[PDB]
Amino acid sequence: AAKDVKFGNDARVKMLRGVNVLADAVKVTLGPKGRNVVLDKSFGAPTITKDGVSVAREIELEDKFENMGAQMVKEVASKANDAAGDGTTTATVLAQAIITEGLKAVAAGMNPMDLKRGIDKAVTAAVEELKALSVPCSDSKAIAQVGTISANSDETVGKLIAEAMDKVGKEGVITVEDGTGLQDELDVVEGMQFDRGYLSPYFINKPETGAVELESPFILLADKKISNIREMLPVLEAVAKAGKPLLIIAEDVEGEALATLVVNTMRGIVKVAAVKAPGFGDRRKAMLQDIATLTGGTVISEEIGMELEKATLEDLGQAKRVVINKDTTTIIDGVGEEAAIQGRVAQIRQQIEEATSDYDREKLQERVAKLAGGVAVIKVGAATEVEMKEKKARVEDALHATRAAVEEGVVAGGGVALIRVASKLADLRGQNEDQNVGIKVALRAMEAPLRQIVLNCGEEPSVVANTVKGGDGNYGYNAATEEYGNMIDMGILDPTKVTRSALQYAASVAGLMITTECMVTDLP
Amino acid sequence: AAKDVKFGNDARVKMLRGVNVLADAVKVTLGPKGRNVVLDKSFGAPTITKDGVSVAREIELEDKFENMGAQMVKEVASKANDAAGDGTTTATVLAQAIITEGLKAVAAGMNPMDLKRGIDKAVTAAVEELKALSVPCSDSKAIAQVGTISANSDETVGKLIAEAMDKVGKEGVITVEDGTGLQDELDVVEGMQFDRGYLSPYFINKPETGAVELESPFILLADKKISNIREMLPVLEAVAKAGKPLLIIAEDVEGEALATLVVNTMRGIVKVAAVKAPGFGDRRKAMLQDIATLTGGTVISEEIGMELEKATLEDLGQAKRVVINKDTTTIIDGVGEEAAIQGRVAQIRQQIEEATSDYDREKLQERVAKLAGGVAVIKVGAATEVEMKEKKARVEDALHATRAAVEEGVVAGGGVALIRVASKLADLRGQNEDQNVGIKVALRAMEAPLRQIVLNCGEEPSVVANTVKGGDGNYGYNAATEEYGNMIDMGILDPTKVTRSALQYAASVAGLMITTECMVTDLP
Amino acid sequence: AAKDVKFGNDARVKMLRGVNVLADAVKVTLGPKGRNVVLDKSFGAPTITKDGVSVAREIELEDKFENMGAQMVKEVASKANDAAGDGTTTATVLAQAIITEGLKAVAAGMNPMDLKRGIDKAVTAAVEELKALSVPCSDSKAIAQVGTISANSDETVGKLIAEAMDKVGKEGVITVEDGTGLQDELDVVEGMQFDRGYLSPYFINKPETGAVELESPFILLADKKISNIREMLPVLEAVAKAGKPLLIIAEDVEGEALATLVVNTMRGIVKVAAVKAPGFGDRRKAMLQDIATLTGGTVISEEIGMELEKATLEDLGQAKRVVINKDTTTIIDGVGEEAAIQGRVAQIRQQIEEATSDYDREKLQERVAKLAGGVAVIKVGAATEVEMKEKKARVEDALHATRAAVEEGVVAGGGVALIRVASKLADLRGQNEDQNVGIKVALRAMEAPLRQIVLNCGEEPSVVANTVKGGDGNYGYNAATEEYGNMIDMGILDPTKVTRSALQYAASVAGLMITTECMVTDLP
């Protein structure tokens, strides 16, 4: 299509207008006296949300140039989210601030590419300075705090996540789903459990729970899929003359094999369960192996020169107890050589180390939690469903923000950390005067989160800032209670990784943004 | 469709307006105080870019005649890019200059076809003169310089490319990809490696890296695809009674053959790896042969009257070590008769000589680097992704510009080279007066790059030009530091091939362009 | 659809307006001080072109009547092109001239159908008169001249074509393709070569060129397609005990036959090449026979009661040398009975005589050049691609114009020939006064090419014409150098066939055109 092209100031005024519309819609949600934004959706009912990235992803403007503005800053809030899990509003507010101040300098005759170099240098230094301030964050109290601020000052969410990490460990997974009741609930699985129900419903040996309860049984791990009773006979026999029940985790069990297995336990010849393998593709055999380690059995892998029939009691795993329902199978305390478990763990632990993406990282720590430590689920309660959605979204947010603190500590919230690094860098200079203005531009921006937080409370933002800047260390404003104090003592902590990440990303985009001299888009 | 036809001056005024819109959008990015252009894309987020060709390819105008203007000059920036890899803005700026000055002469009553002959002659001479000035460019310092100017005055990119060419050689390949971290990184493979993972994941003899490490093994090169264990038995046997492991590079390995091979190493009968062949079609057998040379083995080609079963230890290649992961296979130091390697190299080296295109040139030098010298990868670091894209684009640009310098040396940057050849040709004349004006038109244009560079700094372009033209040799303006000096001493070097190529292409298009008396297009 | 119908003067004024728009766009390119026209193309980049027919084929107008005008004259320029290869602008300019002058007479009350008879008679006479003036054109100097004027005064193209015809002969073919370098290049194949690469890439006995070089070999010509090694054994045997290599030109070679043939030369049992047959359908067997004649072998045609197995050394052709690469096969100097070659030639030479079209003429002389004389390729050099296209187009144009001169001599260019025949016919009369005006109308038109040539130079066209008409024989204006002289001495020659053809076609269309009293078209 024919393109519209705009130059210099005109391009820039339009670009900024774009940024503002997005920035302004996101800003209204920053801080404890943050308000909500309503997001239309033809699809279903509208969405109420405080979550900065969520507002951002919906802004698209009609004026094609303004659009371009918004579509670019949208990336800071977006990137923040993918890395941190929180701070997306802060990120956005910093980005809008650098831009505003930037373009003002560009209009002063400054050289944009230098203003950028300044901003960038100021940021590299602020990041270093934040590493310094961070106190690491490792004790449950600090963790609960980031969780709390993350969840819009909701103490219970803090407490709940803190408790979670305490029980599953560091190498352990925590998921969040909808609860049934009105109140939140934490479930910890001790052991190992995976998403798999019985293939034979006519096996339930306890109709009360509607589940199979195998007492101290053997475990057969079949890599290949079963369909014939033939392959079983040899091993099924040794189990029949041993008394103990048997769980069979195969790729699949079908045909008459499954059908017969029923008639065998139905009579009381043997007690035998059949459940599919956890996973799909190459992941399945990986996870199936994990189970062998915890139970002290051998995977009967058809691929690596093994028949199902040549197996003996030797290759069978063993557990203290087994629980299987329509949806999930649980092994409570397998035999498992102690050293072999943690050996297999420290191996999968280093597989996450060289995991060449994010998905090759997720599933890996999932399995480590199943084997280690443990796995925890947070169930979120709410009265309605619009409530469920905004609450589940906040607990998900806090869950990320704590994970970030743990890997990268905490710093004084209320955006004081940022204000503190701005005075430390009061003496930073560049290679020339334009680079200098570029530094002062980032420093001045570093005040903006605090300034918006206060502005959302209906209070004088410059007056609060003046008096926080009169203080030292962790002295800040508590917007909730309307009085000044030590932010760490008042429990107002942001995780370092998030504050850092907000800064780095806003700087990255806004830095580029201010160097714009020409814009090229489609005609209206 | 019915056409609109415009004549003479009207056609030309419109054609020029077109050129300007494109020229003006490209111009803003020229030089160290160049700014960026934003390019819309419904598709994804907008693109920020300094890269002249990238802006050019997006301009399309609404007025159908103006469009034609822009669509034509767009070819200089485009052609520059395909040949050089850099200089696309310069090219564009020269082209706009010749055109402007041209049409002014045409409006004076000059004969366009003569103005063209003049321009062309002036250029043929400027090209000769540049060959003279070029000092060749062969030392690492000079190379780093073109790299640096190419990458918008980024010393690290210079250094990094210079280092690269130093290690891989002249007949060696350098690619550029996204890095994981924040900083750039150079990887050199010593040896030979190709894009191929193990077909049998159950073979990894080192679960730490998740890779297969065969110590001093034999190598079987099967041209045909394997599916049966039969063909292996004869050779697999001689390897079993020799102790040493065996790598099998076939067209494919599947069926029970693959399946059995697993059970054989799983037990410790033999140590055997299976990986597909590098490539596809006729290229595969070509590349497969290369491997035989480096290892001292024979390709067992089913096509040329050979059975896989009639092979002995004789036909197997041998290496010091082998490393195979999920994605790539590496041979570290094969047996390879020294003379036979470089013999096969100087053969493939002359295959590039008679390579009847560009693709028949690319893959060829790729293989030579795998065998010779070596292959290097530059990994680009950035904080975000909009940064990654503009940075990766600049390193790609520098990588080309150095390759051009090497094949065709360096000259004083800042567009001084061009200004220098313009005074050397002060005494060039043609067959008649119109041809003369045609020469003066190109000479006057030769000043434009310097003139734009200065104009993008917000400084008086004619005043800088006057004082550079007062000097000699390599004396120029350093736009970065705002002071005059010797451009080669200050490290501001452009590669000759690029400066030449900018000129030739702009001249070619603008030369034609000014001879336009009538234009024929579709109705609005 | 409902039609619009216009009568008499109204129809005619519109028809003329149409003609003019097309005429005017084509006119601007006539002569050495001709300018270019730009032709839009959504498809790719616009086209710059001097070539009259190319401009013509693009004009289509919006006013449906004007359109009809243009769509009709478009046929003169089109027809000129198909016959001559050049003169399309001249043709157009004459046509516009006859029309203008015609309709002026029709408006005087003259009877159109008589004006037509006059024009036609004037033309039949002008054609005769041109046959007289033509000096034949047979010497290389004259040929180079038509070539030169054809290629817009480009001496090198002249020289290059003249050289070409000199080497291939009269019964020989010259093609034109894109070159790699900057300069033009002439390639002459001595012998015979056809578009066919080896089917077996594993045969190259010289890896340096990547081609097969069979020294003094036998040649097998198989009409049928081969797939089985059986049929070969008998003959392949006699060649194996003779020492000499063997080329096999079959319809196709595949299956194990091809596969085995490899293993046979790979070992050194026999040296044997396999290439498909040149052509397709009935043309293939025709061309395959040609090869037999040059080599002294028999076509083993399965259709005419012959088995491939019953062949002996007797039926095999023989050559001095053979060269085969991936794309083409060449026979250097076959055994061939001298008389039998030229006998088969004078036979195919008369097959062109009774060739009932143009395609049955093209391929025929192609084969004669392969056998006779020889075949030549002109490779065109240019810096860019817009240059390549306009240059290749001019060399193609000159190539045609010389071929026309050869079959139908040269005459004084600058359109003096035409001006000369106009004074010879000063005394031509018709059957009545209207026929007379009709003659004067054509004569007056005959001046127009000269008149446009001059007008494109910015000079007084009537003043030049007056002074050329004051002269005699070959005295004319040299528009390039701006002085009068003998056109043949100055090398400004047009080929007779083109000048004639321009005239005949313009006359034909414009003759009809002026007899128009009513026009019927679709509604706007």
Short mmCIF file of N, CA and C in Angstrom, two decimals, chain B residues 140-204:
data_model
loop_
_atom_site.label_atom_id
_atom_site.label_comp_id
_atom_site.label_asym_id
_atom_site.label_seq_id
_atom_site.Cartn_x
_atom_site.Cartn_y
_atom_site.Cartn_z
N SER B 140 44.58 -6.72 9.95
CA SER B 140 43.52 -6.72 10.95
C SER B 140 43.09 -5.34 11.40
N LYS B 141 43.99 -4.37 11.48
CA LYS B 141 43.61 -3.04 11.96
C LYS B 141 42.67 -2.35 11.02
N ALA B 142 42.98 -2.43 9.73
CA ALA B 142 42.16 -1.81 8.68
C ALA B 142 40.79 -2.46 8.61
N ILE B 143 40.76 -3.79 8.69
CA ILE B 143 39.51 -4.55 8.66
C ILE B 143 38.60 -4.15 9.83
N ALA B 144 39.15 -4.12 11.04
CA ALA B 144 38.40 -3.70 12.20
C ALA B 144 37.79 -2.34 11.99
N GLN B 145 38.52 -1.48 11.31
CA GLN B 145 38.00 -0.14 11.01
C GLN B 145 36.78 -0.13 10.10
N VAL B 146 36.81 -0.86 8.98
CA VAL B 146 35.63 -0.80 8.13
C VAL B 146 34.44 -1.34 8.91
N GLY B 147 34.66 -2.46 9.61
CA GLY B 147 33.69 -3.06 10.50
C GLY B 147 33.09 -2.07 11.47
N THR B 148 33.94 -1.32 12.14
CA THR B 148 33.50 -0.30 13.06
C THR B 148 32.62 0.78 12.45
N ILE B 149 32.98 1.31 11.28
CA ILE B 149 32.22 2.43 10.69
C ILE B 149 30.87 1.94 10.16
N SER B 150 30.92 0.71 9.67
CA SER B 150 29.81 -0.04 9.20
C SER B 150 28.78 -0.23 10.30
N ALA B 151 29.26 -0.53 11.50
CA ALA B 151 28.40 -0.79 12.64
C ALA B 151 28.10 0.49 13.41
N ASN B 152 27.95 1.60 12.71
CA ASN B 152 27.72 2.92 13.31
C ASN B 152 28.68 3.26 14.45
N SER B 153 29.98 3.15 14.20
CA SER B 153 31.01 3.58 15.14
C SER B 153 31.02 2.72 16.38
N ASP B 154 30.88 1.41 16.20
CA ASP B 154 30.86 0.48 17.33
C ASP B 154 32.12 -0.38 17.31
N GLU B 155 33.11 0.06 18.08
CA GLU B 155 34.43 -0.54 18.12
C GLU B 155 34.46 -2.05 18.36
N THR B 156 33.52 -2.55 19.15
CA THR B 156 33.49 -3.95 19.53
C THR B 156 33.17 -4.85 18.37
N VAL B 157 32.27 -4.38 17.51
CA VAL B 157 31.87 -5.15 16.33
C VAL B 157 33.05 -5.26 15.37
N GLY B 158 33.78 -4.15 15.23
CA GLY B 158 34.98 -4.11 14.43
C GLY B 158 35.92 -5.20 14.92
N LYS B 159 36.35 -5.02 16.16
CA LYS B 159 37.27 -5.93 16.85
C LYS B 159 36.84 -7.39 16.67
N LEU B 160 35.55 -7.64 16.80
CA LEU B 160 35.01 -8.98 16.82
C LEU B 160 35.08 -9.67 15.47
N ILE B 161 34.78 -8.91 14.42
CA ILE B 161 34.87 -9.40 13.05
C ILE B 161 36.33 -9.60 12.64
N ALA B 162 37.18 -8.62 12.98
CA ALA B 162 38.61 -8.69 12.70
C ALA B 162 39.20 -9.96 13.28
N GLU B 163 38.90 -10.20 14.55
CA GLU B 163 39.27 -11.43 15.22
C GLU B 163 38.73 -12.67 14.50
N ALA B 164 37.50 -12.58 14.01
CA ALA B 164 36.87 -13.72 13.35
C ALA B 164 37.66 -14.14 12.12
N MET B 165 37.86 -13.20 11.19
CA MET B 165 38.55 -13.45 9.91
C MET B 165 39.98 -13.97 10.11
N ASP B 166 40.62 -13.44 11.15
CA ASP B 166 41.92 -13.88 11.61
C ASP B 166 41.97 -15.40 11.92
N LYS B 167 40.90 -15.93 12.50
CA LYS B 167 40.88 -17.32 12.95
C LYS B 167 40.37 -18.32 11.91
N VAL B 168 39.34 -17.94 11.15
CA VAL B 168 38.76 -18.85 10.16
C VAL B 168 39.56 -18.84 8.87
N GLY B 169 40.21 -17.71 8.61
CA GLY B 169 41.01 -17.53 7.41
C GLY B 169 40.29 -16.67 6.38
N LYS B 170 40.74 -16.81 5.13
CA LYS B 170 40.15 -16.09 4.00
C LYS B 170 39.08 -16.97 3.33
N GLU B 171 39.38 -18.26 3.22
CA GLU B 171 38.43 -19.22 2.65
C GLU B 171 37.44 -19.78 3.68
N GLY B 172 37.15 -18.99 4.72
CA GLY B 172 36.33 -19.44 5.86
C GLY B 172 35.07 -18.63 6.13
N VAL B 173 34.05 -19.31 6.67
CA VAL B 173 32.74 -18.70 6.83
C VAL B 173 32.48 -18.16 8.23
N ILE B 174 31.78 -17.03 8.29
CA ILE B 174 31.33 -16.42 9.54
C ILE B 174 29.83 -16.14 9.45
N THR B 175 29.06 -16.73 10.37
CA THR B 175 27.63 -16.45 10.47
C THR B 175 27.33 -15.67 11.74
N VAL B 176 26.13 -15.08 11.79
CA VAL B 176 25.70 -14.28 12.94
C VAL B 176 24.28 -14.65 13.40
N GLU B 177 24.15 -14.98 14.69
CA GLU B 177 22.86 -15.34 15.26
C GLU B 177 22.61 -14.67 16.59
N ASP B 178 21.40 -14.85 17.11
CA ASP B 178 20.99 -14.28 18.39
C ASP B 178 21.73 -14.99 19.50
N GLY B 179 22.27 -14.20 20.43
CA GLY B 179 22.91 -14.76 21.61
C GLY B 179 21.91 -14.87 22.75
N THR B 180 22.30 -15.56 23.81
CA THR B 180 21.43 -15.66 24.97
C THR B 180 21.65 -14.48 25.92
N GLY B 181 22.91 -14.17 26.22
CA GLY B 181 23.25 -13.13 27.19
C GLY B 181 23.15 -11.71 26.67
N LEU B 182 23.74 -10.79 27.44
CA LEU B 182 23.70 -9.37 27.14
C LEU B 182 24.88 -8.96 26.27
N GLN B 183 25.94 -9.76 26.27
CA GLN B 183 27.18 -9.41 25.57
C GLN B 183 27.40 -10.31 24.35
N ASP B 184 28.09 -9.76 23.35
CA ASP B 184 28.47 -10.48 22.13
C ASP B 184 29.45 -11.60 22.41
N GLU B 185 29.48 -12.62 21.55
CA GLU B 185 30.33 -13.78 21.79
C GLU B 185 30.75 -14.45 20.49
N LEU B 186 32.04 -14.79 20.40
CA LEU B 186 32.60 -15.41 19.20
C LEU B 186 32.95 -16.86 19.44
N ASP B 187 32.40 -17.75 18.62
CA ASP B 187 32.66 -19.19 18.71
C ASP B 187 33.37 -19.67 17.46
N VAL B 188 34.49 -20.38 17.65
CA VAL B 188 35.24 -20.91 16.52
C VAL B 188 35.28 -22.41 16.64
N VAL B 189 34.82 -23.09 15.60
CA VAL B 189 34.86 -24.55 15.55
C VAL B 189 36.07 -25.05 14.79
N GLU B 190 36.89 -25.82 15.50
CA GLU B 190 38.16 -26.29 14.97
C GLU B 190 37.98 -27.59 14.21
N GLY B 191 37.55 -27.28 14.04
CA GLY B 191 37.52 -28.44 13.17
C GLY B 191 36.28 -28.43 12.30
N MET B 192 35.71 -29.61 12.07
CA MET B 192 34.50 -29.72 11.27
C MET B 192 33.29 -30.14 12.09
N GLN B 193 32.17 -29.47 11.84
CA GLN B 193 30.88 -29.79 12.45
C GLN B 193 29.73 -29.54 11.47
N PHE B 194 28.68 -30.35 11.56
CA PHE B 194 27.51 -30.23 10.69
C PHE B 194 26.18 -30.42 11.44
N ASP B 195 25.10 -29.90 10.87
CA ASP B 195 23.78 -29.92 11.51
C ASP B 195 23.14 -31.30 11.49
N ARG B 196 23.47 -32.11 12.49
CA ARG B 196 22.89 -33.45 12.61
C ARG B 196 22.97 -34.03 14.01
N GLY B 197 21.81 -34.41 14.54
CA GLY B 197 21.72 -35.06 15.83
C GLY B 197 21.62 -36.57 15.72
N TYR B 198 21.88 -37.25 16.84
CA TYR B 198 21.74 -38.70 16.92
C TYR B 198 20.30 -39.13 16.62
N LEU B 199 20.17 -40.28 15.95
CA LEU B 199 18.85 -40.84 15.68
C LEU B 199 18.41 -41.70 16.86
N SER B 200 19.40 -42.15 17.62
CA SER B 200 19.18 -43.00 18.78
C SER B 200 19.52 -42.22 20.06
N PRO B 201 18.50 -41.68 20.71
CA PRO B 201 18.70 -40.91 21.95
C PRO B 201 19.19 -41.79 23.11
N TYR B 202 18.92 -43.09 23.04
CA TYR B 202 19.33 -44.03 24.08
C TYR B 202 20.80 -44.45 23.94
N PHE B 203 21.64 -43.55 23.45
CA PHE B 203 23.05 -43.87 23.24
C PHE B 203 24.01 -42.97 24.02
N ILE B 204 23.54 -41.79 24.39
CA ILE B 204 24.33 -40.82 25.15
C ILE B 204 25.21 -41.51 26.21
#
